[PDB]
């Protein structure tokens, strides 16, 4: 009665992908929640596999290159992440999903790279207000958390500058393997690339016109039509409306409701093909104490849904009976 009876948990406290200090505290925000207890209460065995230590160079060792900020910290961190994810997913090769808590979204280049090494035919569902697919010369910000997909997409490689230290970051995704849900703040060059290469995408306008149910169905149809592929679910907390996830660095109004976020995760979970879910951009240093609690709570409900938690209830593992205790019931007494 469980699609997944065990799961692994990994923290990746990336913070060199964007300028606001605090994404490094994301994994701890989830560890100090009741997430682990609640997951155990649904009968799932969850193993805490610890944290990846990002590589964080100093400014002298890691100057701007092609406008990118902290690009060598990024390339080194990417390779370290990929090795660890690869090993975890191969020890796993009912499947055992890997739950990853970030950390800013730059971690995804590493997680997908390593995941693809174990499962090369995977698809990616990217849940985000943003495209995170800027190529370096088009990025206004130079922030690596806005570029992680570009390094992975084969079709985009003529717009990525060559760098010796990026050699091991091999493009492992075709444009046809990615689908977005939740977009509402694409940069113009992302829009161009997404349309040019036919990346499936469902923006908040699509959610409004189609409804989340049809959006989920169509996204799964686009990249995983017969549920043959492993799914890498990359969930940026900023996909959710700032009313329910305020503690994040690039909040955009008009986002997914928590319920819409839950539906995406419930449907993905129920495919039986959830292989990795990562949750990016939690920043417990942003907003009020209550803002952080709201954001933490949203994240926990989301990750629980990914692992198969049902809002319609779960049956007990053992049904309790009054008589076994030598207790007299009302029905018994009345007779």
């Amino acid at each position: 009665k469980l699609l997944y009876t065990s799961a692994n948990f990994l923290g990746i406290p990336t913070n060199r992908g964007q300028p606001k200090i605090g994404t490094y505290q994301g994994p701890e925000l989830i560890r100090k929640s009741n997430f682990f207890q609640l997951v155990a209460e649904d009968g799932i065995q969850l193993t805490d596999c610890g944290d990846i230590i990002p590589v964080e160079l100093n400014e002298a060792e890691d100057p701007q290159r092609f406008g990118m900020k902290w690009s060598r910290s990024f390339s080194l961190t990417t390779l370290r992440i990929a090795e660890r994810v690869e090993e975890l997913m191969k020890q796993s090769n009912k499947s055992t999903p890997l739950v990853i808590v970030g950390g800013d979204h730059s971690m995804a280049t590493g997680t997908i790279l390593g995941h693809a090494e174990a499962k090369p035919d995977l698809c990616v569902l990217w849940i985000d207000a943003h495209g995170d697919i800027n190529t370096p010369l088009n990025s206004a910000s130079g922030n690596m958390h806005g570029m992680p997909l570009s390094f992975l997409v084969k079709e985009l490689q003529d717009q990525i500058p060559w760098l010796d230290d990026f050699e091991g970051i091999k493009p492992c995704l075709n444009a046809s393997n990615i689908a977005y849900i939740g977009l509402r703040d694409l940069d113009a060059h992302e829009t161009h690339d997404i349309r040019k290469h036919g990346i499936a995408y469902f923006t908040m306008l699509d959610v409004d016109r189609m409804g989340i149910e049809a959006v989920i169905k169509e996204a799964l149809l686009a990249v995983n039509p017969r549920l043959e592929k492993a799914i890498h679910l990359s969930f940026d907390i900023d996909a959710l409306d700032p009313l329910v996830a305020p503690s994040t660095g690039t909040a955009v109004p008009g986002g997914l409701t928590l319920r819409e976020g839950l539906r995406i995760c419930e449907e993905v979970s129920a495919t039986g093909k959830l292989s990795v879910v990562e949750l990016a951009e939690l920043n417990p240093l942003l907003g009020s104490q209550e803002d952080v609690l709201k954001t933490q709570s949203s994240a926990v409900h989301i990750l629980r849904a990914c692992l198969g938690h049902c809002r319609s209830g779960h049956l007990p593992f053992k049904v309790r009976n009054l008589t076994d205790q030598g207790i007299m019931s009302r029905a018994a007494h009345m007779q």
Copy 2:
């Protein structure tokens, strides 16, 4: 042009059903609002029938029994509530609905018991994030507000321990007479009992997939197919999302929007069969001053909807005319 031209109002400041002090202030939160004025402005005559005084024993007089906390305060309070509700509903036997403001949800055992004494064929619509149908030996918390339905459901009586002081609490509901809307935090044994006995239930997942309109229709179909039965609407404020009802003791994210809550109440009201509506779990001692105002406001809009308030407008009782005042209009002047 009014389905209900008069109504009764009753406070029940129960607070021994759960541990957080403050539910006893629920009725006053509504009395100090503009609810009464607004109800009068729609042409309804609302009579304040005062408060029920709960029985609150001391710890020595009311030790834990079968893990239940304050069970004798509960049984005594239940009987006191039922007598008062019964008398009010029989003086009432256009019908006159009774509006009850709590108070924690443990009051429902008493309100339904008394209501059923006046109208034995009634149905119950239970609007709640929670099932409130735990039987005592299955309750992790021992909190009576999580058990009120179990004592009333005939099918569950072999799982209720006999207690002499509970004898007058007679099961007056069949499983087939109850429908839930809004559920998102069932305990495993509740899930078991609800499914085993075929209690109609529409969780937030059902609301997401079906839409509130279909959920309301199907809930009414399940328990009141031809609108032959009186309706007992038991509305836990925690059914609403914490964004609109934060001041309540067991808040769960991902709840009904205020609009969805309004639709449930509007449709129930429009049946002409609303006999009792109770609103449970307001706690003005929880949250900020603004949190309390939001929660108060949500409650007022909800109760107004129950009594027949229309968001699409009400016609004036007397249409005013400019000439009656001896005033010259623009149209008159221009001629």
Copy 3:
């Protein structure tokens, strides 16, 4: 690839239409936002045409007349607004929309009057929790922001008292030219007049039952069936739920989501017939600092949508290419 390549912007800091000081700061709230920058980034040339100076008489010069508060300030301000709007719209006679930021909603009598002078066959889409169509002797409050449409509707002129200084305020709208979306707090006499004269109206109950998509379609069908008419979009920020627009003087729970507000504006924009959009009732002196930021943000997203901003993305004006810079790509290197 742009329906509108230029636009005009006008502030109207009306504050004598209602009692709470602060609506006069509405235009500045938008000017100090990033609205202008974001509009330019989508390729639209936006010209700041400055502010209209409302006429604000003293109490001695402007006593109550027919219960109206500040009615002579209103009539004088109305004529001043209308002259300026008329001149702007005639210099404009791809069309050039006029974006107006208020200011309390009393400004609409002036904006529509002047707009109609340039485009007499226009239709009005009124997005508001309120009807703003009270005739003076029926207004409980005497606040002019609750009456602006009544002076304009030909069918209502036998209920408007004649005043010499209102002579230049000529009724320029038929009941058949107005459609409301968002209503949830009509006064009884407004309900009477709206139904009696067949004004198309879609309240929040209609939005709940029909969905915003059908509501927008039906509103446009009612007043602009073949998109032959110029559209005057009058958007009261209080149409939006107080959760996203708290800083406004008459907030009502259960409003449009930001997304629903965006859909209305996106569809209106896409007709190619958006001629004037005004945004009323911003009050930066109400609520917390965060409340004001939320309200500002909602307003900016709304006005951007009116001017044609697409949540699904915009293409770059020039597509950037790696080689033009003499940079070596990964694809190039690998070959």
